[PDB]
Amino acid sequence: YSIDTNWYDVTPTGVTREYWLSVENSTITPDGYTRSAMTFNGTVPGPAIIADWGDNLIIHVTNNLEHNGTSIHWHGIRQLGSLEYDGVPGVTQCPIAPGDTLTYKFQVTQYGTTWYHSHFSLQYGDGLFGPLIINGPATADYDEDVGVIFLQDWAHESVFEIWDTARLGAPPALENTLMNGTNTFDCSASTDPNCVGGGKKFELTFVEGTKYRLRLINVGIDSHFEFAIDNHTLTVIANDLVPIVPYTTDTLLIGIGQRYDVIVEANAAADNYWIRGNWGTTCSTNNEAANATGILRYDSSSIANPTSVGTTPRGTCEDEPVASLVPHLALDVGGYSLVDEQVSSAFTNYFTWTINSSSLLLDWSSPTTLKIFNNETIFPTEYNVVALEQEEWVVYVIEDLTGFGIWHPIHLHGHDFFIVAQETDVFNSDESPAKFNLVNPPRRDVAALPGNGYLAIAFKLDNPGSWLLHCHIAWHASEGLAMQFVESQSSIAVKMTDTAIFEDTCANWNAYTPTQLFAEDDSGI
Numbered sequence: 001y002s003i004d005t006n007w008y009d010v011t012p013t014g015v016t017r018e019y020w021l022s023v024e025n026s027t028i029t030p031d032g033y034t035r036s037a038m039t040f041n042g043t044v045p046g047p048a049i050i051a052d053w054g055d056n057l058i059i060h061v062t063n064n065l066e067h068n069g070t071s072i073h074w075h076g077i078r079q080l081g082s083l084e085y086d087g088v089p090g091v092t093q094c095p096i097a098p099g100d101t102l103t104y105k106f107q108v109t110q111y112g113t114t115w116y117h118s119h120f121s122l123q124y125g126d127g128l129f130g131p132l133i134i135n136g137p138a139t140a141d142y143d144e145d146v147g148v149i150f151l152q153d154w155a156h157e158s159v160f161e162i163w164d165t166a167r168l169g170a171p172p173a174l175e176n177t178l179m180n181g182t183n184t185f186d187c188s189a190s191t192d193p194n195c196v197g198g199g200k201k202f203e204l205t206f207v208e209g210t211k212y213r214l215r216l217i218n219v220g221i222d223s224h225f226e227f228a229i230d231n232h233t234l235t236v237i238a239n240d241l242v243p244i245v246p247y248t249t250d251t252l253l254i255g256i257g258q259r260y261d262v263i264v265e266a267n268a269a270a271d272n273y274w275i276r277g278n279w280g281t282t283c284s285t286n287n288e289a290a291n292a293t294g295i296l297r298y299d300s301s302s303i304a305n306p307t308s309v310g311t312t313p314r315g316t317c318e319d320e321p322v323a324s325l326v327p328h329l330a331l332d333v334g335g336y337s338l339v340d341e342q343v344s345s346a347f348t349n350y351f352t353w354t355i356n357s358s359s360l361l362l363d364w365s366s367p368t369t370l371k372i373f374n375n376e377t378i379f380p381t382e383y384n385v386v387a388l389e390q391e392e393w394v395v396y397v398i399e400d401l402t403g404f405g406i407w408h409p410i411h412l413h414g415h416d417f418f419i420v421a422q423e424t425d426v427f428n429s430d431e432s433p434a435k436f437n438l439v440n441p442p443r444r445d446v447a448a449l450p451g452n453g454y455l456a457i458a459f460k461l462d463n464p465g466s467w468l469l470h471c472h473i474a475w476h477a478s479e480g481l482a483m484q485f486v487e488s489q490s491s492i493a494v495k496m497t498d499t500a501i502f503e504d505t506c507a508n509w510n511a512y513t514p515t516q517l518f519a520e521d522d523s524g525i
């Protein structure tokens with residue numbers, strides 16, 4: 001097994017790996033400002049889940065929150081034959097009730113960098129995410145793996161406090177950003193007792209001449225980054241969970257939920273350097289956007305702020321150029337049927353996004369998968385179901401008709417897709433399909449729907465189940481910018497063990513909902 005192994009077809013034998021995670025109500029001080037958080041195991045980021053390609057994960061998730069369901073998603077994890085462990089509440093399970101435990105089981109049939117996060121409403125915005133790193137092949141050599149660097153915005157209160165405001169349609173400017181869970185913040189004016197100060201920059205220490213694999217993930221609520229390290233080059237070796245033909249870049253545009261693995265050679269004059277998130281100010285607002293930075297040190301004892309000169313950011317909300325993103329294991333898209341769908345917006349009780357006029361709104365007590373187990377094939381209109389059955393491919397064209405010009409990071413569950421087109425133009429059903437790239441196009445699981453343009457993503461019908469596709473901007477998802485593919489419904493294979501477990505989760509959730517303190521007040525996802 002190697003970098004040229006087809007991991008969609010072949011999977012190594014591995015070992016069983018077991019984790020207990022507690023979804024917790026916490027207090028943290030990541031940037032010198034003390035606030036509530038919703039965490040795995042009291043840390044933001046959550047604990048590292050590290051495994052090998054082909055391992056079986058067993059992850060016992062206990063919900064120790066008092067006032068929310070929860071449901072944990074393993075982002076970009078294919079979940080072939082483990083649909084009920086995808087962690088989408090209202091799609092592949094009922095929410096895990098307070099006090100209850102759901103044990104997620106799945107094999108990792110991919111390798112690279114990803115993460116896990118709650119998919120229950122906005123929870124991941126309060127810190128409910130962690131790294132999921134799967135060891136395997138890599139398209140370039142390096143001597144050291146520094147692991148993951150999370151890039152995010154960071155509020156100074158619960159995302160749930162500001163939801164009622166945000167749902168009037170404008171995402172609010174958050175108070176700060178974190179790089180790998182930390183940042184500075186100026187508390188030396190504040191009369192807020194929580195602003196205790198002492199927040200510190202993310203530090204990364206290089207040994208000169210050593211090669212470092214960095215694993216970048218944008219995990220913000222509503223944030224775009226263009227990661228750069230002053231006077232260093234990034235050699236990009238993977239996008240999401242798909243190794244790519246290495247290419248070098250001064251900066252790396254990164255949408256929410258996207259990952260890149262980069263190799264950085266520490267071949268610069270030994271000094272302190274700015275590490276730049278390069279918050280996309282055009283993409284979304286932040287109170288402290290220029291402070292989305294950290295410190296590269298070649299000398300650990302140095303406590304000096306770097307004074308390096310950075311590269312000029314492209315300053316866009318785009319993804320990396322399609323031409324740059326060439327998977328190592330080349331794969332082409334076969335004959336396809338085309339599904340076309342259109343993003344617009346409406347206002348009801350609040351601001352919603354629509355997919356062909358319907359905003360996603362799930363009933364947590366009746367997930368698509370329960371409906372499937374009950375042999376339903378017609379789904380509520382607000383479940384935004386697109387049915388798929390075998391031409392073994394689908395091109396899904398999603399069009400921004402909102403007029404907003406936001407670059408939406410579109411995430412597909414159950415599949416890597418193929419970026420056959422990512423265009424800043426109006427989609428024409430008679431002209432545009434011709435301009436698709438079907439021959440080893442970029443392949444990944446988050447890609448930008450360009451603002452005012454279209455994203456055309458192809459996938460194979462190789463994974464029966466009900467698969468959410470959504471904007472990964474947390475507000476947008478909560479605002480129903482989502483649909484779901486019900487793929488070969490009659491081919492979905494579920495174990496009696498897993499059906500029993502699913503039913504129990506739903507039973508406990510149904511036992512919880514009559515005295516819940518808080519109702520569902522978003523899409524559910």
Ligand SMILES: *[C@@H]1O[C@H](CO)[C@@H](O[C@@H]2O[C@H](CO)[C@@H](O[C@@H]3O[C@H](CO[C@@H]4O[C@H](CO[C@@H]5O[C@H](CO)[C@@H](O)[C@H](O)[C@@H]5O[C@@H]5O[C@H](CO)[C@@H](O)[C@H](O)[C@@H]5O)[C@@H](O)[C@H](O)[C@@H]4O)[C@@H](O)[C@H](O)[C@@H]3O)[C@H](O)[C@H]2NC(C)=O)[C@H](O)[C@H]1NC(C)=O
Nearest residue numbers: 016017018019044045047048050145146147148149180204
């Ligand atoms: C950004 O910030 C994050 C922190 O949020 C930071 O994360 C760090 O990532 C590093 C690189 O990826 C990482 O370094 C690695 O750590 C690995 C593992 O850490 C260990 O855990 C080991 C294994 O767990 C155990 O299994 C053994 C048997 O082998 C048992 O003895 C042990 O009891 C435990 O038990 C079992 O767990 C299994 C599943 O794991 C189950 O199957 C079993 O049933 C049982 O429950 C252990 O061997 C180690 O001692 C250690 O605890 C290393 O393997 C790897 O080689 C590498 O060194 C680091 O740990 C992360 N740190 C934190 C705090 O999360 C990033 O580095 C930050 N990024 C940057 C750029 O700074």
Ligand SMILES: *[C@@H]1O[C@H](CO)[C@@H](O[C@@H]2O[C@H](CO)[C@@H](O[C@@H]3O[C@H](CO)[C@@H](O)[C@H](O)[C@@H]3O)[C@H](O)[C@H]2NC(C)=O)[C@H](O)[C@H]1NC(C)=O
Nearest residue numbers: 067068069121158159160161162163164165518519520521
């Ligand atoms: C999940 O749990 C959290 C508790 O952490 C619940 O958050 C709460 O959500 C409600 C309803 O949105 C909030 O009420 C609103 O507060 C704002 C801001 O002060 C106000 O403008 C509104 O008029 C409204 O009253 C409440 O503040 C918020 N609480 C906290 C501590 O954040 C959330 O509703 C739970 N969701 C589910 C589905 O269980």
Ligand SMILES: *[C@@H]1O[C@H](CO)[C@@H](O)[C@H](O)[C@H]1NC(C)=O
Nearest residue numbers: 019020021022040041047062
């Ligand atoms: C997380 O917390 C739970 C509950 O305390 C504990 O059982 C579990 O072992 C912890 N897991 C890790 C990875 O720290």
Ligand SMILES: *[C@@H]1O[C@H](CO)[C@@H](O)[C@H](O)[C@H]1NC(C)=O
Nearest residue numbers: 025026036038065066067068
């Ligand atoms: C977390 O704790 C806060 C403060 O005690 C509480 O008001 C809130 O309801 C809790 N959140 C959840 C999801 O249980």
Ligand SMILES: *[C@@H]1O[C@H](CO)[C@@H](O)[C@H](O)[C@H]1NC(C)=O
Nearest residue numbers: 184185186288289290291292
């Ligand atoms: C980052 O924040 C600190 C604290 O306010 C400030 O001194 C510094 O100027 C900031 N950098 C900017 C605004 O570019």
Ligand SMILES: *[C@@H]1O[C@H](CO)[C@@H](O)[C@H](O)[C@H]1NC(C)=O
Nearest residue numbers: 339340341342355356386429
């Ligand atoms: C969505 O709407 C457009 C325009 O009416 C139409 O071409 C397309 O087929 C619709 N898609 C679905 C899946 O209903």
Ligand SMILES: *[C@@H]1O[C@H](CO)[C@@H](O)[C@H](O)[C@H]1NC(C)=O
Nearest residue numbers: 370371372373374375376490
């Ligand atoms: C769903 O269909 C299968 C196969 O016909 C059947 O065995 C099962 O009992 C059905 N569930 C229902 C009708 O609720």
Ligand SMILES: *[C@H]1O[C@H](CO)[C@@H](O)[C@H](O)[C@@H]1O
Nearest residue numbers: 247248249321323324325
């Ligand atoms: C990735 O590669 C493409 C194609 O060579 C470039 O256009 C891009 O700027 C980046 O280097």
Ligand SMILES: [Cu+2]
Nearest residue numbers: 065066067517
């Ligand atoms: Cu309470």
Ligand SMILES: [Cu+2]
Nearest residue numbers: 075117257411
């Ligand atoms: Cu995700």
Ligand SMILES: [Cu+2]
Nearest residue numbers: 074075076413
């Ligand atoms: Cu996902």
Ligand SMILES: [Cu+2]
Nearest residue numbers: 408471473476
């Ligand atoms: Cu969006």
Ligand SMILES: [Cu+2]
Nearest residue numbers: 411413468470
């Ligand atoms: Cu998702």
